[PDB]
Amino acid sequence: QQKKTIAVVNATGRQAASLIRVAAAVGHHVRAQVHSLKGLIAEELQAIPNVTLFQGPLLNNVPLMDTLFEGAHLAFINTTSQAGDEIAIGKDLADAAKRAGTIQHYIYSSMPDHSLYGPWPAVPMWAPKFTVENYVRQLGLPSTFVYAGIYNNNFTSLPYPLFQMELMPDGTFEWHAPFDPDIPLPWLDAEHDVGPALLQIFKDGPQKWNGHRIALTFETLSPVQVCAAFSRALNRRVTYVQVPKVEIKVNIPVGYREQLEAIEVVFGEHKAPYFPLPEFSRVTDEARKLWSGWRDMEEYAREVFPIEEEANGLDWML
Ligand SMILES: [Cl-]
Ligand SMILES: [Cl-]
Ligand SMILES: [Cl-]
Ligand SMILES: [Cl-]
């Protein structure tokens, strides 16, 4: 009954773009911030009638935030550490949403602070989000926090850290990571499943979800199980190899290296849970109730992975 307007930031990011596409298709008007209008996705998103893009930085730009929230009733916020000041930006956005007065439900995409649950270090790009989560909880605005599982499409044969599905000379594939071969990890098809799940949270409403933490993951798989889904999907031998240090074969930003080293220690060295919150110990229950049509790792490897690889210029799929 009159779809409410949704405000979003980082519009071209996976989580935001997924929500935007489905929300607009069902009638929601969307107000989305993007750092720049250029780009395959930004251009794709601005061509959707129900969507309006507002280009500019979030860093020290509250005015843009006030503009974004004007006339909005719902918000889905996901920040990045890129411009630095992620905590600051997250608080400014929450304050801007409160000030707009019209936001009835504010969803923030949070991550754990591992050092709170054991003799473990805080993963640099995750812990900050939890801080923002604590802040948002204090605002007199209904809020819900989603914890995203590992994206299925992090996988690529390009020489990128942690999630390379390396193509060997013999046509076989190998995934090398510090993750214990058998401890199940939480996965997520961002493209297809983030959008529908977030929309159901909005449909259910703030009385049901105010204050809740939801694990946005629809299936748990150990690395060994992931490789077998790929092997089964591509009819190729795909095997997992546990490695102490992440193989970093290309140059990466300083902050990303620190993130990876934290990962070597937390999952490699300590074998700590991905979601170390007591609430998340099935961890997939709520997510599946929210969106029944979620896709698994085998469908990704077989139906999307080949196309994404060809799009990146790879030829193994001929
Ligand atoms: Cl609505
Ligand atoms: Cl438009
Ligand atoms: Cl509150
Ligand atoms: Cl490089």
Side-chain angles (χ1 to χ4, degrees):
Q1 266 49 301
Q2 291 247 263
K3 295 310 186 70
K4 295 166 192 206
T5 291
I6 305 167
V8 186
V9 293
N10 186 204
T12 68
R14 283 134 139 165
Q15 301 179 48
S18 181
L19 171 62
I20 293 174
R21 294 179 184 103
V22 295
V26 297
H28 289 279
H29 293 286
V30 179
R31 295 172 73 69
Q33 172 272 334
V34 292
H35 287 302
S36 69
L37 299 175
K38 74 178 172 189
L40 232 57
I41 297 166
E43 293 171 15
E44 177 213 336
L45 298 184
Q46 69 172 183
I48 300 173
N50 279 175
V51 174
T52 298
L53 259 26
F54 297 96
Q55 71 277 31
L58 290 177
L59 177 67
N60 307 312
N61 190 357
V62 167
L64 211 203
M65 302 185 173
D66 288 329
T67 289
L68 185 72
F69 293 121
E70 184 171 53
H73 321 275
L74 309 166
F76 167 63
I77 304 291
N78 167 54
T79 49
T80 67
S81 62
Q82 315 321 309
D85 253 323
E86 172 168 34
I87 293 173
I89 291 174
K91 292 180 175 174
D92 275 2
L93 286 164
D95 290 339
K98 171 80 293 181
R99 220 151 49 223
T102 50
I103 302 294
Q104 318 153 349
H105 201 351
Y106 187 99
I107 296 177
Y108 179 65
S109 191
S110 194
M111 280 306 277
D113 183 331
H114 284 253
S115 78
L116 294 170
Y117 312 88
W120 312 317
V123 186
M125 293 177 178
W126 297 344
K129 296 182 188 297
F130 193 71
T131 291
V132 177
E133 179 179 324
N134 281 164
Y135 182 81
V136 174
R137 285 182 176 275
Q138 263 76 88
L139 299 193
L141 181 76
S143 56
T144 298
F145 310 93
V146 292
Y147 285 68
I150 309 179
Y151 304 132
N152 291 356
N153 85 331
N154 278 321
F155 286 117
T156 176
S157 73
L158 287 173
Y160 297 168
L162 196 58
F163 296 101
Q164 185 194 193
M165 199 46 95
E166 181 178 20
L167 173 79
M168 306 303 167
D170 70 337
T172 68
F173 279 106
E174 288 175 33
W175 176 26
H176 298 9
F179 298 115
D180 184 272
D182 297 292
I183 301 176
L185 297 163
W187 299 87
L188 198 214
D189 181 332
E191 182 167 58
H192 309 293
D193 306 322
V194 166
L198 294 168
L199 279 186
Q200 189 58 236
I201 293 173
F202 286 140
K203 289 181 177 84
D204 286 350
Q207 301 179 83
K208 172 170 174 61
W209 299 113
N210 189 13
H212 287 246
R213 292 190 175 106
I214 300 173
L216 263 193
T217 180
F218 298 85
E219 99 182 302
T220 58
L221 297 169
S222 58
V224 162
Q225 288 178 293
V226 166
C227 291
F230 270 75
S231 178
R232 191 190 323 132
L234 303 172
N235 296 311
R236 299 208 180 198
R237 181 202 167 201
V238 178
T239 80
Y240 182 78
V241 183
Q242 207 277 182
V243 178
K245 293 217 299 180
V246 178
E247 313 178 325
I248 299 179
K249 314 179 176 175
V250 296
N251 278 348
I252 58 175
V254 181
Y256 189 37
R257 164 158 270 101
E258 291 164 358
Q259 172 76 353
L260 300 166
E261 306 180 324
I263 287 183
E264 301 181 325
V265 179
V266 175
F267 307 88
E269 186 180 312
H270 291 98
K271 297 177 174 50
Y274 191 84
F275 293 142
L277 283 290
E279 309 172 47
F280 308 132
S281 74
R282 297 296 72 188
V283 72
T284 61
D285 285 347
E286 314 262 67
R288 294 183 187 185
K289 308 171 190 177
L290 286 173
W291 174 219
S292 305
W294 58 277
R295 302 178 190 187
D296 64 28
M297 190 61 87
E298 196 282 323
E299 282 173 8
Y300 166 70
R302 183 166 66 60
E303 319 173 328
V304 176
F305 183 66
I307 301 300
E308 285 183 344
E309 284 277 294
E310 197 190 335
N312 273 323
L314 300 152
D315 318 283
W316 66 260
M317 78 300 294
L318 178 53

